[PDB]
Amino acid sequence: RPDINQGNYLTANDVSKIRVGMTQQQVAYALGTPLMSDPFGTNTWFYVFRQQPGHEGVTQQTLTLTFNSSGVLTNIDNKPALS
Amino acid sequence: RYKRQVSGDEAYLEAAPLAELHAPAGMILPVTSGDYAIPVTNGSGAVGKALDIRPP
Amino acid sequence: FVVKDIHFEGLQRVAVGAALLSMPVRTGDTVNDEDISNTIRALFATGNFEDVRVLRDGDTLLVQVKERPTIASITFSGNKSVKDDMLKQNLEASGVRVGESLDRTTIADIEKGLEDFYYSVGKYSASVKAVVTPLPRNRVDLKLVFQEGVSAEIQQINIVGNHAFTTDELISHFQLRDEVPWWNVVGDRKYQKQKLAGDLETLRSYYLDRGYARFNIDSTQVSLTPDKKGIYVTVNITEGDQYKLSGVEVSGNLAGHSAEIEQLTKIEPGELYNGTKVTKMEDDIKKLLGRYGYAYPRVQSMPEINDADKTVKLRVNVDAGNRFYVRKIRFEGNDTSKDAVLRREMRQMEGAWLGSDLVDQGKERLNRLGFFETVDTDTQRVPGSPDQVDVVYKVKERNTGSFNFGIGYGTESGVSFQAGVQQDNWLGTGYAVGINGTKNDYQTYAELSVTNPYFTVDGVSLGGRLFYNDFQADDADLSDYTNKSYGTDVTLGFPINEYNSLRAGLGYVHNSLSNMQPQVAMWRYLYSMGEHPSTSDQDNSFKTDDFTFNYGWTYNKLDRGYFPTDGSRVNLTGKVTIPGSDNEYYKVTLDTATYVPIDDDHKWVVLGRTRWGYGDGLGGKEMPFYENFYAGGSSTVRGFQSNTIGPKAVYFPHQASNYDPDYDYECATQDGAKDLCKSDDAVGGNAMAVASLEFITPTPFISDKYANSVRTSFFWDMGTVWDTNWDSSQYSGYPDYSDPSNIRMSAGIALQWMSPLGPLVFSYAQPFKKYDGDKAEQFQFNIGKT
Amino acid sequence: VPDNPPNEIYATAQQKLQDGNWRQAITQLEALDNRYPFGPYSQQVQLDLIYAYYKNADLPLAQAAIDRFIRLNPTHPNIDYVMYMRGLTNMALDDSSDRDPQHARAAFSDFSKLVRGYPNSQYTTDATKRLVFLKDRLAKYEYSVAEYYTERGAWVAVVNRVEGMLRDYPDTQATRDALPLMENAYRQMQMNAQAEKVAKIIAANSSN
Amino acid sequence: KMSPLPTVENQFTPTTAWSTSVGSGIGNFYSNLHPALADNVVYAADRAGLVKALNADDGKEIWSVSLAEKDGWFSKEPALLSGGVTVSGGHVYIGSEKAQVYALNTSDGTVAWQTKVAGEALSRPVVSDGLVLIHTSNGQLQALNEADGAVKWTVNLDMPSLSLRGESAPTTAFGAAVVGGDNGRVSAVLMEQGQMIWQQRISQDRLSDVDTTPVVVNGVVFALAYNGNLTALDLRSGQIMWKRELGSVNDFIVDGNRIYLVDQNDRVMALTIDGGVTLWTQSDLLHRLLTSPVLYNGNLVVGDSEGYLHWINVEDGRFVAQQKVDSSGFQTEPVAADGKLLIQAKDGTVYSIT
C-alpha cells in the first residue's frame, strides 16, 4: 500500500535550534505547530516523525517537549528511533 | 429518496443516553468546547408520534 | 431628532417585525440624517424592497416602501434543446424561483445569463428574451422566450509559420476538428475554449520535444462568420531552429539538497533538446522536495539560448516552500456513499505533513471511481495557525445504477448480444453488483456477480460469481457435442506493482455433457472417466461436478491501451482440480503481447504476440475435451477458419438421431458407414502454441489530417495444436495427432479504426502453409464487443 | 386548480390534509399561496404548505418555505413550530452515520435554537430527544473516521480525532467506545506514558 | 427564419453575356476573393490556388495558372487564396490563408514576386503610393513594395478575443492609409513608414465590432461597424461628426450626396451624407445573406445566398429586376466598373451581366 506518513517532519537540525528555557512560541516558530499535545492535565508538545514505506516497516523519532506552568521549556526529550 | 419517505412518514428512535465521563486522579479530561451541548429543558411534552405536528 | 414612534406604509408580505428588526434606528433614539441614510440602505440590503423612503412625520419616523413583485409563474417558450425542469433547476440555483421575488434590474442579467449558457454550447445566435407580466396583489409571471438558432462549426483549423511540419499532420494530434468523416469517430466539430487550450499545449509540446526550444505561439485568433454558423481557428507560431541540451544549472532556496538534485539533472551532453525530459526533471525535483516535507515546492526552468553552438543551457529556478500539516481531511456531498468509501482513495494522510500532489492524486482517484459527477478540492488554512490546514473534497454524487445493451458482429461468432443490469456502488458501499448476459452463435452466458474492491484496506478484492453457460460445439465449428454448465466462483485479486496484479480463487462447476456424436479422441477421455457409452448412438448424457483452485498473473506495461506503440502485456491463467472433484486435471494459459517502436515518432511498430496453452489429467484420467485449446480464427492465427487448426475427429459408425437425406452427416451407418471415418471438423487439443510477428505501419492513402485514427498492420501468424493422449500405434491409417511438428502459418494485412458502429478490425490473410483438413477463411472482420 | 373562491378551496385543502393524501393538498394550497400571497390568514396557509411538504417528502421545497416564512415573519407566535419543522426537515435528510453529517449538524442547530428561544414550547421535549440522538450520531461519525484511520495505520490522525471527540462529544456512547483506539494509537507510536493515562480514563469509567 | 424570395414584375429583363468557371472557387468558406477587371480583361481565381485571366466580352481564357505547390504528380497542397483579386500596375495581387501574398504578371500569369506576411492575408489588397497594403488576420497592417514585395513597414492593431471573419482593406488619401479595425476602431496611418496619426473608436457576453472598408470624400471619412454605428469622421482628426445606430461588414457606396449600405440583417437603405437621414428602405431581402451592393446603370445590384441578383431603384427603394444566375449562391462582392458587371458564385463561376 502507499507510504504511511504521520506526525511532524523533524529535520534533525531544527532539533538543535531548541534549548531549555524557551517559550512555546519560539519552539512553535522553530518546529511549527505540534500535531498533538497532551490533552490530559499536563501540557507537553508531542513531535512524532513517523514514516512507513510499504514492506519496509516504520521509522520513527519522538521529540517530546515538556513545558512548565508558565509555558516555558523545562524538559527536552528526544528519542531518535525505536526498537 | 425512498429512505426519506420513511422519515417524512413517522418513524422514531430512542438511542444511547448521555453519561458524563469521569476523570481519574492525577489528570483531567479535556475542555468542554460547548458547541454540541444540550440544556436540560424541563417538563414533558408528547414525543414520537404522540406529538401532534399539525400546524396550529 | 427624537423618534417616539416608527410607522410603516406599503408592507404586504414583509410583516412589521422583519422590517422593524432590520432597522438600526429604533424607537426612542435621537437621529441625524446619517442614521436615516444607514437605515435606508439597511432596509435596501434585505432583498425585500425595490424603492424605499425613510421620512420624518411630526413626531413619528415613517418608513415608506414598495415590495418586490412576487413570482407566481415561470414559463418557457421556444426552448427546443433544453428541458423546462432542468432550465428551472439552474434558475432556482442562481436565485429566481416561484414564491420568491424579482429584482427588476436583473431581467437583463437573466437573459444574458441563459443567453451565455447558449453561447457556451454552440449557438452564438441564441437569444433569450424575458417577458414580465404583472398580476394583482403585487404578483408577476415571467415568461422566457427562446430563439436558439443554429450551432456553429469549425470551417477551418489553420496554422501559419510552420515550415518544419505540414499543418494537417500537426492538426492530426489535435482535439478540435475541421473534418469529420462519416466512417471515422475522430471527434465532433463543436467548439469549446478548453479543447483549444489543450490543443495549444499539444502543439507546444510537439515542437518542444523535437528540440525547438525557441518555439513560441504568437497569437490565436478565433474568427466567426457573420452568419454565426462558421468558426475559424488560427494559431500563429514562431519556430526557432533546433537545439542540443548543453546542461542544467540549479539555483534557488534548495533547502540544502543541492547534493541530490545534481543526480536528477545529470544529462548526456549533445542530446537533442527535449521538453518532456525537462518536465520530468521539474517534477522529479518537485517530488524530492515533496518527500522532504515541503508542501508546494516550485521548479521553473527557462532555456538560455546560445546561437553560436546552437545549444541551449537549461536554467532551473528551484523554490522550495514551507511545510504544512493536515489537521483534517473532510468530505462533503457524499449523502449516500459512506465516508470510508471516499477516504480510502486518499494519498494525503490526516495528522501528517502536506503533499500538494498527494492531494490531487486523491482527486483523480476519486474521479476514477465514477461514483461522483463532479469532485473538487479545497485547501483551507486552519484559523490562527501558520502551517495547519484542512483539505476538503467536495463531491457531487452520481447515480451508478445502469442498464447496458451491446451488440457486435464477427466472422468468429456472427452477431453477438451483450446485455445487463449493473450497480457499481451498491448502496454506497463500494460493492459492485451485476446481473449480466452474453449471446452469440455457439454459446449463451449469464452471470450474477457481487464484488468488493477493498476486502483488505490496501486494495485486495473479494470476488463472487454465480453463472450459467450453454455451449453448442457444432456452431463453434467443432465436432458435435452439447455442454450445459452452471456453477460459482470466489476470487481474491491483489495489486502488487501498478503494472502487475495477481489473483487466486475457489470455483465449483457442474457440466452436463450431452448429444455427443461418437468419435475416438472424445471417447478416449470417457473411458478415462470410467464411462462407457454407445458408439453408434449419440443419445448420451454425462454429468460432472468439479471443484477447482484457479490462479492468475496479469502484467500490463503498455504505453497506451488504444493503439499501443510500446510496452508489453502478459497474462497467465491456470486451473487445477482440488480432490473431491469427479475430474482430475490441470490447465495453464499464457498470453503475450509486446510492442517495439523503431522510430522516434512511434508510427513504425513491431509486434510480437504469443499464446501458449497446456493442460492434462492427473490421476490417470484425462483432461475433459470441453477444456481443450484451439487455434486459427480472427484473434489467434488469421487466414484460417476459427478453431480449424489441430487434431480432427475420427468418427465411429453410428445411426443418426432423425436420419433424413438432403442433410449431410458424418460416418452415418444409414449412408453406408461400417468403419471409422476421417473428418475435417476440428476437435481441439490439450496442447496449443501460437505466435505472430506483426509490423505496424502508417496508413498510406488517408489524408494525414485524420490518418492516425486508422492503424494498418502487416502480419505473419503461426499456430499449432495437438493431443498428447493420441495413440498413433492403434490408428496407423490416420494422421498422427500427437505430432506437434505440424506448424500452420499465414501472412496478411489488418486494418483497425473506430466507426459510428464501434471498434473495427479487418484482416485479409493467405495461409501459405496448411496441413490436410485445415479450413481457410481469408477475409475476417469484427465489429464492437464479440 | 379551479378558480373557485379561496374560502372553499381552503375547506377543500382542509379535507385533503386530514385524508393523508399530500400531493392533493399541496396543489390546492400552492394555488392559494401563489395566487393570494398576503391575506389576513395567508401565513396560516404557508404553515400548512410546510406541513404538507414535510410529509410529502419534498424536503428541498419545505426548507425554502420555512426560510422564507422566518425571513418575513420572525416574531410571529408560531415560529417554534416552523423551526421544529426545520429541524425535522434536516433530520429527514440525515437518514441514520457513516455519511456526510452536515444535515445532522444543521438539525442540531435548528433544535438548539428552538430549545433556547422557546423552552416552554410544545415541541421542546421531543427536540431534546432528537438532539440526544444527533449528538451521539455526530460522535459516531467521528468514531468511524477514527476507526478507518485505526485500520489504516495512521495513529496521529486517530488520537487527534478521539481527542476531538473528547472535546466535543465527551458524554456520548460513541466517545466511550473510541478511547481504546486512542490508547492503541499511543501504544503503536510507543507513547506508552500517554496510553497509560487513556487506560485510566477507560478503567475509571463505564462502557455504557 | 429567412425572408422568402420577393415576387416582383420586372421590366426590364436582364441577361448573362457569358459565364466562365474557375475550379471549385471559394466553397462554403467565408472569403473576400472576387473577380478583378482591368483593361478589357478579367482576373479571377479559386481557393485551391488557380488564377485565370479572361476576355471581358467572350469570357475566353487568355492564360491560366495554378499557384498550389506540388511535390511530384501525387502531392498537391491548396494555396487557400482568400484576399483579392486586385489589379494595378500590370500586377495581380492575391492574399493567401498560408500568409503569402502573390503578385502575378498581367501578361502571362507568371509570379512576379511572392512574399511572406504577418498572417492570413484575408483583406483585399489595395495598391497606392507605390505600395500594396495588406491587413492580416492578426490585425497586422503591412505594406509591401509594389515592385519587389518587400515588407516596408508593419502596423499592429489590437485584436479582441472574438472576431468576425475579417478583414478591412484600407483607403488611401493624402499619403495616409485609413483602415478599419477588428478592435472596433478606425485608424489612420502615414504611408511612408506607418506613422500613427489618429485612432477613433466607433464601437458601442459577446457584443463586438469588426469594421471593413471605409470611404473618404472631401475631408470626411465614412466607416461602418458590426452592430455598431455608421460614422462620418473628420479626415484630419478622425473626429466623429454624425452617427447612425446600424451596422454591417460588407462595403457601402458613397454617391451623389447619398449613401446605401447592406445592413447586418441584409436591409438595403438610402441615407443622406450630411446627417445620415434615412430616405428609402427595403426589408424584403432580410437574412438572405446579401453580398456587397454595387451601383450599376442607376440601379443597385446585390447578389444573395440562393444565387439571385436583385436590381433595386435608388429613388424609392422599389425593386426593378430579379434574376437567377447560379445555384451555388452569391456571397462575395460584385465588381461593377467599365460598364461590365462581374460577379462570382461560390463555385468559382464568373458572370458578365448586361
Side-chain angles (χ1 to χ4, degrees):
Chain A
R1 34 76 197 158
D3 319 270
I4 249 62
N5 287 10
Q6 287 295 281
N8 289 87
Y9 206 112
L10 294 168
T11 71
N13 153 279
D14 277 323
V15 309
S16 309
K17 296 197 283 189
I18 47 96
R19 287 111 61 192
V20 209
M22 290 241 242
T23 68
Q24 281 170 358
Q25 312 247 309
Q26 318 180 266
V27 248
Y29 171 89
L31 296 179
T33 334
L35 248 331
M36 34 176 49
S37 341
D38 171 284
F40 305 117
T42 175
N43 90 86
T44 311
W45 272 204
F46 292 116
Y47 282 134
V48 207
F49 176 51
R50 187 116 174 293
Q51 57 199 344
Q52 189 191 24
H55 288 244
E56 257 298 347
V58 271
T59 63
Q60 188 202 332
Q61 67 163 194
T62 324
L63 196 274
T64 328
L65 300 186
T66 335
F67 303 71
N68 81 112
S69 353
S70 178
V72 191
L73 215 72
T74 62
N75 199 338
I76 161 176
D77 179 34
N78 188 110
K79 319 195 94 310
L82 67 202
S83 187
Chain B
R1 286 181 50 181
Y2 307 92
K3 317 173 191 174
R4 290 155 201 178
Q5 267 288 18
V6 178
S7 294
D9 194 13
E10 302 186 5
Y12 62 87
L13 295 172
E14 306 297 324
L18 300 158
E20 299 292 343
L21 224 79
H22 295 0
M27 68 193 301
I28 191 58
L29 296 172
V31 287
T32 56
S33 78
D35 313 276
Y36 313 96
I38 307 308
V40 49
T41 66
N42 191 11
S44 170
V47 316
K49 307 206 185 201
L51 185 60
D52 181 28
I53 74 173
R54 285 187 299 110
Chain C
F1 168 67
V2 175
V3 169
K4 283 203 165 189
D5 190 32
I6 310 177
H7 212 161
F8 288 97
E9 284 183 357
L11 292 178
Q12 320 194 282
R13 279 201 301 155
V14 180
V16 182
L20 214 54
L21 183 279
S22 178
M23 300 164 57
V25 61
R26 309 214 59 72
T27 318
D29 294 353
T30 295
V31 201
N32 60 355
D33 281 28
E34 301 288 343
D35 291 333
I36 305 231
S37 293
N38 262 13
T39 292
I40 284 170
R41 83 166 306 192
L43 275 158
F44 257 116
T46 61
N48 282 271
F49 309 132
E50 203 187 300
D51 177 78
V52 184
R53 304 193 309 191
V54 180
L55 276 65
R56 185 233 268 244
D57 173 79
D59 309 279
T60 295
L61 188 147
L62 214 177
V63 187
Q64 303 182 322
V65 63
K66 205 158 191 171
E67 306 192 352
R68 306 199 197 190
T70 315
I71 300 167
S73 317
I74 313 179
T75 61
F76 298 68
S77 160
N79 55 291
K80 305 305 209 74
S81 189
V82 177
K83 297 172 58 179
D84 290 24
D85 199 339
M86 220 280 291
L87 225 169
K88 178 209 269 189
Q89 252 209 51
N90 298 28
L91 278 194
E92 69 177 343
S94 292
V96 59
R97 94 193 286 183
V98 188
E100 297 298 336
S101 52
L102 173 73
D103 201 339
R104 317 198 90 139
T105 76
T106 61
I107 293 110
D109 294 273
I110 302 170
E111 293 170 7
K112 305 333 166 179
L114 298 170
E115 196 165 356
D116 196 22
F117 184 109
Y118 272 117
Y119 290 5
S120 300
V121 78
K123 294 161 189 60
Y124 303 132
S125 186
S127 152
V128 184
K129 211 74 69 176
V131 176
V132 185
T133 296
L135 319 166
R137 284 161 263 131
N138 198 17
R139 292 174 295 160
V140 58
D141 291 336
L142 192 145
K143 165 156 53 179
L144 297 168
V145 185
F146 300 74
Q147 311 287 50
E148 308 199 346
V150 184
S151 315
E153 307 196 338
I154 291 69
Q155 298 295 341
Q156 172 164 39
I157 273 107
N158 191 8
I159 311 187
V160 51
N162 42 7
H163 311 291
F165 302 115
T166 69
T167 168
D168 286 25
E169 199 268 308
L170 297 173
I171 312 321
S172 70
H173 309 281
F174 277 36
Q175 202 99 285
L176 294 180
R177 284 288 166 176
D178 39 335
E179 273 207 46
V180 190
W182 72 263
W183 52 276
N184 243 326
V185 174
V186 112
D188 296 30
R189 192 158 79 162
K190 277 203 168 298
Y191 183 79
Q192 304 174 312
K193 289 189 173 183
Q194 296 74 321
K195 294 183 179 179
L196 176 60
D199 288 18
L200 298 177
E201 230 189 11
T202 318
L203 177 62
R204 249 185 293 269
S205 306
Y206 188 106
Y207 271 98
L208 291 172
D209 298 355
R210 268 147 271 260
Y212 299 85
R214 292 230 75 178
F215 173 85
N216 188 34
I217 273 170
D218 299 346
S219 62
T220 69
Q221 312 88 63
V222 165
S223 328
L224 177 141
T225 59
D227 68 340
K228 318 296 286 297
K229 294 181 61 163
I231 293 166
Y232 299 69
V233 181
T234 308
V235 48
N236 308 67
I237 71 172
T238 299
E239 48 168 62
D241 38 24
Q242 319 200 237
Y243 293 106
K244 291 294 204 64
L245 182 62
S246 196
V248 194
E249 215 181 27
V250 208
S251 57
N253 66 350
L254 303 167
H257 299 278
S258 184
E260 282 173 276
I261 296 181
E262 300 291 354
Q263 284 296 329
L264 295 182
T265 65
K266 76 174 192 173
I267 68 103
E268 282 281 23
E271 193 173 7
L272 182 63
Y273 181 87
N274 190 321
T276 53
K277 301 214 66 50
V278 169
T279 312
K280 214 242 165 188
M281 293 181 183
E282 293 186 336
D283 280 283
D284 286 342
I285 294 163
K286 204 177 312 191
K287 183 179 179 177
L288 183 70
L289 287 154
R291 231 185 59 225
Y292 282 127
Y294 313 119
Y296 307 101
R298 276 86 47 70
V299 182
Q300 295 159 258
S301 80
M302 312 152 207
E304 200 186 62
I305 298 100
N306 176 240
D307 266 25
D309 302 25
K310 200 72 71 61
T311 66
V312 156
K313 210 183 188 192
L314 182 61
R315 265 268 200 70
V316 198
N317 158 264
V318 189
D319 201 301
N322 280 319
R323 273 124 167 173
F324 299 77
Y325 297 104
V326 184
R327 165 164 79 77
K328 290 285 197 70
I329 294 176
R330 291 176 46 215
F331 296 110
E332 52 181 272
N334 59 292
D335 298 13
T336 208
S337 189
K338 51 160 68 175
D339 181 275
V341 151
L342 292 74
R343 194 177 297 276
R344 71 168 191 290
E345 298 300 333
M346 285 299 117
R347 273 293 305 102
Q348 176 58 48
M349 297 297 294
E350 182 175 314
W353 52 98
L354 181 50
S356 66
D357 49 31
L358 296 184
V359 172
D360 290 314
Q361 294 183 35
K363 164 189 180 184
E364 291 184 56
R365 290 191 66 114
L366 270 165
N367 279 125
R368 287 202 316 242
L369 301 199
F371 288 17
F372 323 99
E373 186 183 354
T374 77
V375 181
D376 297 328
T377 303
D378 193 27
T379 307
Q380 307 172 325
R381 317 278 278 275
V382 174
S385 291
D387 54 349
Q388 279 199 353
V389 171
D390 294 350
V391 183
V392 190
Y393 297 83
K394 191 164 177 281
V395 302
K396 181 57 158 50
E397 272 187 334
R398 161 199 290 174
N399 187 342
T400 49
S402 170
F403 270 133
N404 48 36
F405 192 86
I407 179 170
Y409 191 28
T411 67
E412 312 80 52
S413 60
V415 153
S416 52
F417 310 108
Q418 314 84 4
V421 74
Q422 179 67 273
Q423 179 49 279
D424 296 322
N425 195 21
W426 172 264
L427 229 40
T429 323
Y431 278 78
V433 309
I435 299 168
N436 183 273
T438 293
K439 168 71 181 195
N440 64 353
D441 280 14
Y442 53 75
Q443 68 146 35
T444 82
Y445 179 28
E447 85 187 336
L448 186 148
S449 63
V450 178
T451 180
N452 184 16
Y454 289 78
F455 163 78
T456 302
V457 187
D458 303 344
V460 187
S461 48
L462 187 281
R465 217 178 69 172
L466 254 167
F467 66 90
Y468 174 82
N469 180 241
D470 177 281
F471 178 59
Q472 281 288 133
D474 262 337
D475 292 274
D477 312 285
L478 303 184
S479 165
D480 184 21
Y481 70 91
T482 279
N483 193 21
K484 289 195 304 309
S485 32
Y486 76 80
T488 182
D489 288 49
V490 283
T491 177
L492 303 155
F494 24 90
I496 63 162
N497 198 265
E498 262 72 87
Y499 296 133
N500 310 64
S501 60
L502 291 194
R503 54 191 172 289
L506 290 172
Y508 157 71
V509 58
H510 173 84
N511 317 271
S512 81
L513 279 167
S514 61
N515 204 76
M516 327 177 232
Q517 189 171 135
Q519 68 195 19
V520 176
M522 210 192 299
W523 255 236
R524 189 192 60 235
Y525 151 72
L526 277 304
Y527 282 159
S528 293
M529 293 299 301
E531 280 260 18
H532 33 49
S534 184
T535 60
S536 59
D537 186 23
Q538 76 164 58
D539 178 85
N540 49 38
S541 298
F542 189 12
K543 309 189 184 165
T544 36
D545 296 272
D546 319 312
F547 304 90
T548 38
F549 158 76
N550 325 289
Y551 62 82
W553 166 51
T554 320
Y555 163 83
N556 185 16
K557 217 274 195 297
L558 301 175
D559 53 39
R560 223 193 331 160
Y562 197 95
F563 285 27
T565 183
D566 189 33
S568 305
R569 194 195 184 263
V570 172
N571 197 329
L572 193 102
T573 303
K575 214 206 309 306
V576 78
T577 57
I578 43 177
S581 56
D582 291 328
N583 264 285
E584 305 194 303
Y585 72 107
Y586 70 86
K587 196 166 65 176
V588 171
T589 59
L590 174 54
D591 295 87
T592 290
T594 269
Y595 297 72
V596 171
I598 65 176
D599 75 322
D600 204 328
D601 291 320
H602 277 205
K603 277 153 60 182
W604 300 76
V605 192
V606 186
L607 194 68
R609 319 196 313 271
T610 92
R611 196 172 155 88
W612 318 90
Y614 191 97
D616 202 336
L618 293 167
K621 307 191 196 172
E622 276 194 33
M623 175 180 68
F625 57 92
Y626 49 91
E627 299 289 347
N628 287 341
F629 302 99
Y630 316 90
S634 161
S635 65
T636 65
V637 181
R638 290 153 294 191
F640 296 90
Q641 186 211 79
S642 68
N643 311 314
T644 197
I645 318 287
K648 314 309 176 78
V650 179
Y651 290 111
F652 288 130
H654 81 109
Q655 263 198 226
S657 52
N658 290 82
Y659 177 70
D660 305 280
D662 310 17
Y663 301 170
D664 184 41
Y665 296 77
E666 307 284 335
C667 200
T669 62
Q670 305 146 322
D671 288 315
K674 295 180 175 180
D675 197 25
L676 280 54
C677 321
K678 216 198 298 262
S679 63
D680 284 314
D681 48 352
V683 296
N686 67 335
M688 174 263 287
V690 169
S692 68
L693 172 73
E694 306 202 328
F695 183 25
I696 308 179
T697 82
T699 306
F701 298 120
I702 296 162
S703 74
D704 304 330
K705 200 159 79 241
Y706 56 98
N708 52 313
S709 69
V710 184
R711 160 162 284 177
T712 285
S713 176
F714 288 97
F715 62 81
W716 172 30
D717 302 328
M718 302 149 44
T720 305
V721 190
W722 66 104
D723 177 29
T724 64
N725 295 280
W726 182 254
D727 192 357
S728 184
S729 192
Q730 179 163 19
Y731 302 79
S732 311
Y734 306 105
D736 186 17
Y737 293 140
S738 45
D739 190 51
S741 175
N742 310 128
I743 312 296
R744 276 53 164 258
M745 298 197 163
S746 67
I749 300 173
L751 288 217
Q752 198 163 1
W753 74 88
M754 181 67 59
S755 76
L757 301 172
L760 275 61
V761 48
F762 296 75
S763 45
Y764 178 78
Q766 172 71 349
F768 46 87
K769 260 208 272 184
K770 66 208 181 310
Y771 291 49
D772 183 66
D774 288 327
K775 295 166 187 164
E777 188 165 24
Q778 315 200 14
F779 178 83
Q780 282 137 324
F781 61 79
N782 245 289
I783 324 293
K785 196 183 194 69
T786 62
Chain D
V1 181
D3 301 276
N4 314 332
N7 301 318
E8 98 184 37
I9 301 181
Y10 188 60
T12 303
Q14 273 284 12
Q15 284 301 299
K16 288 237 171 192
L17 223 56
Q18 290 168 334
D19 277 346
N21 218 318
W22 311 128
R23 191 77 68 195
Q24 321 285 9
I26 291 185
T27 57
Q28 295 300 325
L29 291 153
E30 246 177 348
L32 236 62
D33 189 33
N34 282 341
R35 293 168 183 170
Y36 300 74
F38 48 85
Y41 57 102
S42 49
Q43 316 102 289
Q44 185 171 346
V45 169
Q46 293 184 21
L47 296 172
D48 295 24
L49 282 167
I50 278 166
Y51 174 59
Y53 277 123
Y54 172 62
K55 299 216 70 60
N56 195 97
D58 297 335
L59 305 176
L61 322 187
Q63 319 215 251
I66 292 145
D67 292 21
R68 147 163 59 261
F69 190 98
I70 298 193
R71 273 188 305 105
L72 302 206
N73 294 341
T75 57
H76 186 271
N78 300 317
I79 273 90
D80 59 340
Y81 180 95
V82 179
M83 291 220 282
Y84 179 76
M85 295 302 290
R86 189 175 180 182
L88 288 176
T89 248
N90 289 290
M91 273 227 72
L93 293 149
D94 181 43
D95 188 33
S96 310
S97 168
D98 215 319
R99 295 173 284 179
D100 189 20
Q102 75 168 89
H103 297 100
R105 245 157 241 153
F108 208 95
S109 164
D110 306 321
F111 288 115
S112 295
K113 293 185 206 108
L114 174 67
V115 304
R116 284 202 306 274
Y118 312 79
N120 294 342
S121 192
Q122 273 155 304
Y123 325 96
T124 187
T125 300
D126 181 272
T128 50
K129 278 280 185 175
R130 287 184 208 275
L131 278 161
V132 176
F133 179 32
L134 287 172
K135 222 186 173 175
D136 188 74
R137 143 67 165 129
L138 291 170
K140 279 190 292 172
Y141 182 79
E142 301 304 330
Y143 180 46
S144 63
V145 183
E147 193 186 48
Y148 173 79
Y149 277 120
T150 311
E151 294 183 27
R152 176 54 283 173
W155 315 110
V156 177
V158 182
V159 355
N160 277 94
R161 285 198 171 267
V162 191
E163 183 196 337
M165 289 171 62
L166 272 154
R167 172 170 64 266
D168 293 339
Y169 327 94
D171 55 338
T172 60
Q173 173 56 43
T175 309
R176 304 170 116 80
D177 291 338
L179 303 167
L181 296 91
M182 175 132 76
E183 196 197 340
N184 203 329
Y186 285 130
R187 289 202 173 285
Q188 294 300 324
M189 302 185 284
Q190 299 199 347
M191 294 168 54
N192 316 288
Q194 196 61 32
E196 179 62 11
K197 331 193 188 176
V198 187
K200 299 174 178 174
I201 316 190
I202 301 171
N205 188 247
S206 299
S207 293
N208 294 281
Chain E
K1 301 170 184 173
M2 157 173 164
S3 288
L5 182 65
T7 300
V8 130
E9 66 192 353
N10 60 283
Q11 220 186 16
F12 55 84
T13 299
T15 84
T16 302
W18 51 248
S19 67
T20 304
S21 192
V22 191
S24 181
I26 53 174
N28 192 26
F29 293 63
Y30 206 73
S31 178
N32 174 260
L33 187 42
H34 56 67
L37 169 57
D39 298 310
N40 198 20
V41 47
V42 180
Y43 307 81
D46 60 350
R47 173 185 269 279
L50 184 57
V51 182
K52 294 203 164 180
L54 300 177
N55 179 285
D57 300 324
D58 310 307
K60 281 189 66 163
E61 168 178 318
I62 291 83
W63 47 249
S64 291
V65 62
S66 184
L67 287 164
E69 293 301 333
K70 294 180 72 166
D71 274 32
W73 308 57
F74 26 90
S75 175
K76 189 166 198 173
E77 302 189 1
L80 312 105
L81 322 192
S82 173
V85 186
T86 296
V87 280
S88 183
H91 282 94
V92 201
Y93 301 108
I94 320 182
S96 195
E97 307 250 30
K98 279 288 180 181
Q100 295 278 39
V101 177
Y102 310 87
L104 302 169
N105 282 291
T106 49
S107 312
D108 41 337
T110 54
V111 175
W113 53 262
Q114 199 161 305
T115 303
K116 181 76 186 58
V117 299
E120 295 176 9
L122 308 186
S123 76
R124 167 168 60 82
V126 309
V127 178
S128 179
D129 290 275
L131 294 180
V132 198
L133 267 36
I134 309 301
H135 186 179
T136 265
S137 68
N138 309 155
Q140 301 287 100
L141 191 73
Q142 297 190 273
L144 299 183
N145 278 318
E146 219 186 292
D148 56 318
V151 192
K152 186 175 185 186
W153 54 261
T154 303
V155 175
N156 172 33
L157 314 181
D158 299 327
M159 296 217 67
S161 62
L162 180 64
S163 176
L164 290 290
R165 197 70 184 148
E167 292 291 337
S168 184
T171 44
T172 65
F174 300 103
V178 195
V179 70
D182 315 88
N183 203 338
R185 281 149 189 71
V186 187
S187 301
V189 296
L190 285 186
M191 286 294 302
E192 182 66 85
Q193 76 315 88
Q195 195 167 307
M196 190 65 226
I197 299 182
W198 58 256
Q199 170 173 119
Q200 186 72 279
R201 170 267 199 167
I202 54 165
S203 191
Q204 174 182 335
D205 50 287
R206 283 289 162 71
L207 302 82
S208 169
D209 59 322
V210 179
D211 226 90
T212 308
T213 306
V215 67
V216 59
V217 300
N218 311 324
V220 182
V221 178
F222 292 95
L224 182 57
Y226 209 101
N227 204 31
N229 313 324
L230 161 58
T231 42
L233 305 171
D234 167 271
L235 174 57
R236 305 187 71 103
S237 62
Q239 173 200 118
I240 307 172
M241 309 201 317
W242 58 264
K243 278 189 303 187
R244 188 76 190 213
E245 290 150 325
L246 40 77
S248 157
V249 320
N250 45 40
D251 299 15
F252 60 90
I253 59 170
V254 158
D255 169 83
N257 58 323
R258 288 151 150 178
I259 316 170
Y260 327 102
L261 64 88
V262 165
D263 193 39
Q264 295 256 267
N265 313 332
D266 310 332
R267 271 185 190 104
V268 183
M269 350 166 289
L271 308 198
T272 62
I273 191 158
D274 55 274
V277 188
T278 307
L279 308 185
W280 54 257
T281 316
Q282 187 63 268
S283 289
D284 275 22
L285 296 166
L286 224 54
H287 301 100
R288 297 188 55 83
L289 306 210
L290 302 164
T291 77
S292 284
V294 306
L295 209 56
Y296 189 62
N297 304 337
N299 292 319
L300 275 174
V301 177
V302 281
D304 77 333
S305 52
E306 305 201 337
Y308 288 96
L309 279 178
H310 310 286
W311 311 54
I312 178 182
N313 175 29
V314 294
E315 298 296 289
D316 59 337
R318 78 181 183 92
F319 293 110
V320 309
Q322 200 168 155
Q323 188 180 8
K324 182 67 145 293
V325 180
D326 189 278
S327 309
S328 312
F330 285 140
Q331 171 230 134
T332 78
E333 56 187 48
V335 195
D338 304 24
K340 291 256 62 181
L341 176 57
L342 300 91
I343 184 164
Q344 196 202 47
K346 307 190 187 181
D347 63 325
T349 311
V350 194
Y351 292 95
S352 281
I353 309 291
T354 58

